[model samples]
Target chain A: EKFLVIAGPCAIESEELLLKVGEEIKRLSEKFKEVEFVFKSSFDKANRSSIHSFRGHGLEYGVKALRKVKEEFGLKITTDIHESWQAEPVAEVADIIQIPAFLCGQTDLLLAAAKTGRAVNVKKGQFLAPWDTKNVVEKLKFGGAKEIYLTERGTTFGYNNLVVDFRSLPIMKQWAKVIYDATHSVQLPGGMREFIFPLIRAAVAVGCDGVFMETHPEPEKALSDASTQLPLSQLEGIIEAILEIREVASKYYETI
Target chain B: KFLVIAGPCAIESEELLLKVGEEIKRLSEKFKEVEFVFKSSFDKANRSSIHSFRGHGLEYGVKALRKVKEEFGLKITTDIHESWQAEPVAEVADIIQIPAFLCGQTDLLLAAAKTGRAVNVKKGQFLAPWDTKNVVEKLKFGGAKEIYLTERGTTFGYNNLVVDFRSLPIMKQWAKVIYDATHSVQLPGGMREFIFPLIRAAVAVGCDGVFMETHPEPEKALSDASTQLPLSQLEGIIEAILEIREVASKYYETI
Candidate 1:
C-alpha cells in the first residue's frame, strides 16, 4: 500500500528556495519508493490573522515559481487558492488545488477549483463540524470533480488555541480521502512545535490517506508560519516513523 | 465546593421570578452548608440571531429582582451588558456579573468593580483558560477584591460546544471558578440531551460553585427554554452534585 506525503514550505518564499525544498523531496521520493510525494506550498495566505503578515509571491509569480519546481525536480505540485478566479491559474501548475480553511465554505471557490478538473484538497474550517464536510464533498462532486480530499487542521478550541480531535479523521474519511494537516493544527499565534509529531502520530494511527506539513531549511527564519514549519533536517526521521505507524494503522482499518 | 446560582435564564415575569426564587430558598434551607444565590439576567444583549425576547427591560427587570430578594429573603445576582447599568444593578444585586461576550470590556469591568459588589465574570467562550488571568488582573486593578470566573462551554465546532474538564483546575487558580452547566449544553436553536454528567465532571475536577438556569415549564420559557433544567429536576441535580463535591473536596485538600 502507498501513502501520500504533501510537504513543502508554508509559502513559496523564493524560486531558489522552493527549488531547494523540491530537491530534498526528490531525494526522499527516491528513498521511499512506496510513498507518493507531492510538493505543496501556498501561493497566497490571504487569511492570515494580521493584514501585515507575509502572504508569499502574488499569483503570477507564485504559479511561475511552482512551474519551475515541476520542471526541475520532475515532481507533482500543489498550492492553495483564496479567490475563485485564482483556482484555474493555480491548477495550471498545481496538480491539486487547495482551499483555504477559512474559505472552505464558499460555493463559488469550490466550483471554480472542481471545474479545473484537478484534484481538490479542502481544509475543514475550524468553525465547521466534521459531519458538515459531507456538504463540501457533494458540492465538489456536483462541480464535476473526480478526486476530492478533506483535511483536518484543528477545531477552534478558544481564542489563539486549537485542539486536534482524532475522531475527525474517521468522520471525514467516510466522505473522501482525508489528510491530516500536522503543521497548521499546532499553530497558535506562532505554534507549539513540540506537539506536531505527537499529533501526526495520533492522526495517522487513527487513519488518514495522507499527511500535509510545512517544512523549511531553518523554520525560525521562514517568512510565514515560521514557528510551525518543521525543520528540514528532521523530515527523514518523521517520514520513517510515519511509514512504520501507517503499517500498524493499516491493519486496524483493514479489519474495519 | 458548595455554592449554587439557580434561577430562570431571564427574568420573564415577577410571578415566575418568585416561583423559581421560592424553590431556591427551600433548597438553601434544606442544604445548610450550601450557599444559594438567585441569578437571572435583566438584558441578554448578545443573543443568537436576535428577534428573541431579552427580558422586561432593565427598569422593570431590577424591580422584579428586588422583589424576589425581599419576598424570599434570598441573595440576588444578575448580569450587566453596559458600563452604566453596573451601578443600578449593583443597588439590588449582591453579585455583579459580566456577560461572557463582554468579559474583556475594560470600562464595563471597571464599572462593576467600582460597585463594591462581588464580581463574577463568565469566561468568554472564545477565550483560553490561561488568558483569564488578564480578566482577573483587570478586576483586581479596578479595586474589586472578591472575584469569580465561570467556565461555560468553549467553542468546539459550529453550533456545538464541549467542556474541557482540565480548565476547571486551571481557572481555579485565579478566582472562584463556576461551571455554568446550562449554557455548556446549549445549541444554536435548541439543546443537547445530556447535562448531569457534565456537572458531575466539573465538580469532581474542581469548581467553587455551579450555575444553572431552571424553568417551571422549560418548553414555555421566554429565553434559553430548551437548555434550562426543568424546575422539578433542580433539587435532584444539586443533591447529586453535593455528594460528588464532598469527595472531590477531600481529594483536593489531601493533595
Candidate 2:
C-alpha cells in the first residue's frame, strides 16, 4: 500500500513559488515510490484569525497556479475550498478536493465537494469530537463521495492553543483514510518546531494513512501559518523518518 | 497551605449534602494543616444538557447549603451565575464562585466582589491562562480583597475537556489557583480513572487548591454522575494529595 502525502505552501502565493515547491515535491515523489504525493495549498484562507491577514490569490488565479504545477511537475494536486460554488472549478484541477476544518459540518459544502467526483478530504474541526467524525463521514458518503479522507489538524485546547489526541487517528480511521496535519497542530504563538517533528513521528507510529504539512522555502516570510510551517530544506529528512515509522507501524495495522 | 473544595455536584437533598460535608469535615480535622471547604452548586447553570438536574432555586438551595455549614461546621463554597446572586450567596458562603462560562461577565465579577466574600472563578474553557490576568483585574476593580482562579479543563474537541497542567502554575502567578479535578476528567467529556493522576500533577505543578465533586453513590447522582468521585474513594485521594502538595511546596518556593 502506498502512503499518501498532501503538502504545499499554506497558500498559493505565486505561480513561481508553486513551481519551486512543486519541483522539490516532484523529486521526493520520484525518490519515494512508496509514497503518493499530492501538492496542497489554500486558495482562500477564509478563516484567518484577523481580517488583515493575507488570504491567498482568489480562486480563479489560485486554481490556474495549481494547474501549472500539475503540468510542469506531473504531480497530483490537492487544495481546500471554502464555499460550495468553488467546488466544480476546483475539481477541474484538484485530484483530491479539500474542505476546510471549520466548514467540515456545512452539509451543502460537503455535498458540493462530494458531487465534484474527486476524493473529498475533510479536516476534522478543532471544535469537533473524534467520534463525531463518523457523522461527518456519513454525510460525505451520502453525498456520493467515492473516495473519502479525514484529516486531523489537532483539537482546540483553551485559547489559541491546540493539542493532538493520538487516539483520534484510529478512531477516525474506522470510516476513511486518516491524515495527520503536522503544521496546523502547533499553531501556538512561540510554539517551536521542537514539538512538530515528535508530533509527526507520533502520528505515523499511530498508523495514520498519510501526513499533511505546510512547507516553505523560508517559513518566516510565508503569508499564513508562517510560524508553524516546516522549512522546505528539512522536509526530505522528516519524510525519510516517517517512511521508517510507517514501515514498523504497517506490520501491526494495514493502511486503510 | 493547601485547600480542598469538595462536595456533591448539586444539592440533591439535605441528608445527602450533610453526609458528604461531614466526611469532608472529618478529613479537614485529620489533616490539620489543610483548609477544607464544602462545595456544591445551588444552580448548575452551565450543564451540558438543559434537561439535566439543576438544584433547587437560589433561596432553597442557599438554605440547604446553610444547613451543611451549621451542622458540619465547614466553610461553604458554591457557584453563582447572575449578578443578583452575589448578595444572598455571600450570607452563607465564605467563597462565591463564578462559573467557567461567566468568568468574563463584568457585572457578575463586580457584584461578587462587592459582597466581600472571597471569589473563586473557574477559568473559561475558551480562555488562556495568561489572559486570566484581565479577569483578576476585573475582580480587583470591583474591590475584591481575595480572589482564586480554578482551572477545570478547557474545551477539547466538541464535548470533551483536557487539562493543560501548565495552567495551574501559570494562573498561580495572578491569584491562588485551584485545579477542578472532577470536571477535568469528565469523559464528554469518570473518567474517574484520570482524577487522581490529574490532581497529583496539579499539586506537583503548584496549585494552591483542588476542587472535586463527590457522591455517596455516584451512579445515582442526579447530575454529573459519571464524573463524581465515589465517597469511599475521596479519603484515599485526599491523603495522596496532601503528601504530593507537601513535596511540591518545597520546589514551588524556589520557582
Candidate 3:
C-alpha cells in the first residue's frame, strides 16, 4: 500500500521549463522515499472551453520535450491523449497515457490507449459516477492490458463549475489505483481558482492510492493552467500535511 | 400532456442541423398531442471558462436557427443574455428565453417581453424558487402574451447544485412550469447521469413542459458539450416521460 504522488504542470510550455521543473521534482522524489512519482503534463488540451484556447505545443514537439525530461530526470512520465490516432505516438515516448476526463467514455480512444501496452490512466468524466469507471476499466482489461489507473478530477456542480465527490476515491479504489487530481479540481475555467485543500483532504481520508497535482515554481507565468497550478514552494508543506494524515489514518485502521 | 423543447446548443454544421431537427420532429409526431419547440442558444452568455466560447454571433446564429424553423415548421425557443439582443433574436425566435442568472435584471425582462414573443424564463441557481415571481410579474407587466418558467437546479455549495423537486408546483402558480430536465442533472462535463431521476420526479409533480438541451453525440458537442444528451438516448428518455405525463395528466383531470 504505497502512496503515489503524481506532480507536474497541466500542460508542457517549453523544453527549458520542463527540465527546470523535472529536476526539482526528481530531487523531491529522492528525498521522499514513500512517494511514487509519476510526472504528469498534457501534450494537447483537447477540451478547452473555447476553440480559441491554447491547445499546447502540438503533439510532435510536446512529446519530444516530455521524452527529454524523462531521459534527463530518469522518471516515469504521464501525458493526456484525446484522439485514438495519438495513442501509438504518445505511447512510444511516455510510460503512462492518460485519457482526459471529457474523453473518458470514447470507447475507441479508451481501447486504443489500452492496446499500447503501457499503463492507461483514465480521469473519470465530471459528469460520470464513481462506479462508472468499471465500464472504462473493463475496456482496458479487454484490450489486453493489466495496468490501469483511474483519476477523479471533478464533477459538474453548477454551470461552469466542478465538484470532486470524496466518496469516489475509495469507491473507485475497488477497481484500480484511484488518483485524486488536486489542481484541476479547483479550476474555475478561464483562470478562476477555488476550493483545493478540502477536496485533497477528503480524497486522502477516504482512501486514495495516489494524488495527482500540477505544480509550477511560478504558476501565474505558466503557459497553461497558470491560475490553478499549486506553487512549488507550497509542495513540501502540502506533502508533509498529507503524509501526516495518511499516517494517522493507517494507525487508526491498525487499531481497529 | 406537456410540450417538449429539444435542440442543440448552436447550429454546428448544416448536416447535423437537419439531422437533429428530423429526429425530434419524428419523435414529437409519435407522442399524443406533443407540441414540440426547438431550442438552441444563438449566443452563450455565461460560459464557465471565459476563454471558451461566445456562440455564433447574431447574424450567423439567427440565420441557422431560422433555417431549422423554416425547414421543420416547429416552434422555436432560444436564450437571450443582453437586453439589446431581444429585438433581433425575437424576430427569428418564437420564444425569447431569459437565462437564469439574468432573470433578476429588470430591463432585460422588459426588453424580452416587448418583442411580443412568448418569454421562457430560467430560474437562477442563486435565487430561491419563490423569487421567480418578480420575473413573472415583470413579463406580464411588459405586456407579453404568454410566459413560461423553467427550473434549472439551485446552487447547493461551491461548484455544486441540487434540484429541489418542490420547485415544480411552486413555480406553476406564477407561470406555466417547465422543467429543464437536461440542465438539471448536469454533474460537470455536461453528462448528467441523474437526468432519469430528475425527469421522473418533475413529471410526477406536474410540470407543464420539459426543456432539454440535446445533441447528436453529446460527448463530442462543442458548447456545454458535457451535459447534452446523446441522440440515441433521447428517444428512450422521452418515451419514459410520456408514460409519466399520462399518469399525471389523468390525475389532474380527475381533480
Candidate 4:
C-alpha cells in the first residue's frame, strides 16, 4: 500500500528548528523505504486561544524559511493558510496549501487557496461530520484544484479538548487521500502530554493512507504547540510501533 | 421566543467588544420576550495557550460587565475560578458558573453554593455522567437551592471529545439541565459552525434550557468566539428548540 509520513514542527519558529526537523525526518524516510515524506508546519496559527499567542514568524519570514527547507531537503512540503491573501505567497513555497480546520467552510478562502494550484489538504473541522468534508472538497474542486487531501485532527468535546473517531478514516477515504493528524488528535489543549500515544494507536488500527504530525527535537523549548509536539527522542519508537501495528492489521485483513 | 446570549472569554474593550447582547436582543425580543446574558471571563486559569488573555482583573471585569448590564438590562454571568470570587462575582453577576476543568474542586463548589447565587456547573470532559452526583451533593451540602448542570462534551479519543445526550436525563435527576448548544459542537481548531444537529438531538431528549455563546460576528470575537452563534441565527434555533421542548414536555406531562 502507498503510505505517507508527514512530519514537521507545529510552527515555523526558527530556521534551526525547521531545518533540524526536516533533516531528522528525512533520515527516517531513508531508513523506511515505503514511507513518502511531506514536511508540514503552520505559517500562521489563525485560531490560537489568544491574540497574544505566537502566530509563527509572519508570512514573509515563514514562507522564505519553508522555501529554504524545501530546496535544501528536496522534500514536498505542506503548511496551513488562514486567509485569502496568504494563498498566493504560501503556494509559491509550499507543495501543499493546507486549509486550517477553522477556515474550511469559508468559500472565499477556499477558492483563493484552490486558485493557487497547489495540492490542497483540508483538515476536517472538529465540529464537522465525516460526510460534511465532501462539501469542502467539492468547493475546492469547483475552484479548479485536483490534488486534495483530507485530514482528521479530532473533534471538540467541551471546552478546549479534542477526540478522534476512527470511523472518520474510511468515511473520508471515499473522497480523498485520508491523513490522520496524530499530534493534533492527541492534544489535550492545556493538557497535551497525556494522550498522544493512544490516539496514534487508534488511527493506525483503523487504516489510514498517511499519518500527519508535528515534531520537535525539544518540545518544551519550541515557540508554539510545544506541549503537544512529539519529542524527537521518542519518534523512532512511535514510528516503529505504528508500522508494527500496520503490519499486523494488514495480515488480519488478508486472512479475512 | 427565548433569546440566546454568548460571546468570548473577556471583553477587550467596548471598542473591540462585539456587543453580543445588543445584537441578540433585537432578534430575541422579536421572536419571544427575550432576555440576554452577557458572558466573558473574569479570569481564564485553564487556558491552553498559557500566555493567553486571563481576562480583565476581577474589579475591572465586574465593572465591564456591570456596564453591559446597565446599558442592555441583560442578566450577566462570568466564570469564577477561586473561592473568594464567589460572593463578589455574584454581587455583579446574575449567575455564577464553575469552569468544567475545575468541576471537581470541592472548595470552589462549596463557596459558590454558599453565596446563594444561581450556580451553573459544567460537567468536566474527563468525568462520566453519573459522576455528577458527587458534584451536586457538594452544592446541596453548601446550602444551594438554585442550581443548573451543563453538559459540554466528553473525552473520547485523543484531542477529541463527544456530547452524550444520555447525560441530560442522568444529570436532570439532580438539577435542571442546560444543554450548551454551541460549545458542544466545537471542533479542536476553534471552528464552531457545526452545532445545530446535536443541539436538536439534545432538545428532543428533554433538556430544560439551552446555553450558547452568541456574537455579532463570531470570527471577530476574542475567545471561543469561533463556535458561537451569530446573533441573527439565535431566533431560528430557539424556535426549533422550543417546539421540541414543548413536544417532549407533553410526554412527561402524560406520564
Task: Give the winner by lDDT.
Answer: 1
The regions of model 4 sitting more than 4 angstroms off are A251-256, B1-255
Q: Could you give the candidate ranking by lDDT, starting with the highest?
A: 1, 2, 3, 4
Per-model CA lDDT versus the true structure: 0.84, 0.83, 0.77, 0.74
List residue ranges in candidate 3 displaced over 4 A.
A189-194, A253-256, B1-255
Q: Tell me, what's the RMSD of every candidate?
A: 11.1, 10.1, 12.7, 13.2
Clashing pairs in 1: none
Model 1 chain A: worst 10 consecutive residues (lDDT sum): A44-53
In candidate 4 the C-alpha lDDT for residue B144 amounts to 84
Query: Residues A88-170, candidate 4, lDDT per residue (tens digit)?
Result: 88889888888876456656567788898898988876656687787778778888888898999987665456777778888
- Model 2, A1-256: lDDT tens per residue? 7899888999888988899999999999999999999998888888777889898779999999999999999999999888899899999999999998889899999999998889999999988988899999999989999999999987766576777665667678889989999888877732446557656655665567899999999999999888888999989988987776556444444334
After the best TM-score superposition of candidate 3, give how far the Cα of residue B29 lies from its true spot, in angstroms.
12
lDDT of 2 by residue, B181-213 (tens): 888867663266556655655665567888999
Q: For residues A148-225, write the lDDT of model 3, one tens digit per residue.
A: 999988865755567677877767777888888898887753234556666687777766778888988899898778
For all predicted structures, in order, the TM-scores are 0.55, 0.54, 0.56, 0.54
Q: Which candidate would rank higher by lDDT, 1 or 4?
A: 1
Which of candidates 1 and 3 reaches a greater DockQ? 1
Better of 1 and 2 by DockQ: 1
* Model 3 C-alpha lDDT versus the unseen true structure: 0.77
Error of 4 at B75 (Å): 22
DockQ of each: 0.08, 0.03, 0.04, 0.04
**Clashes per prediction?**
0, 3, 8, 13
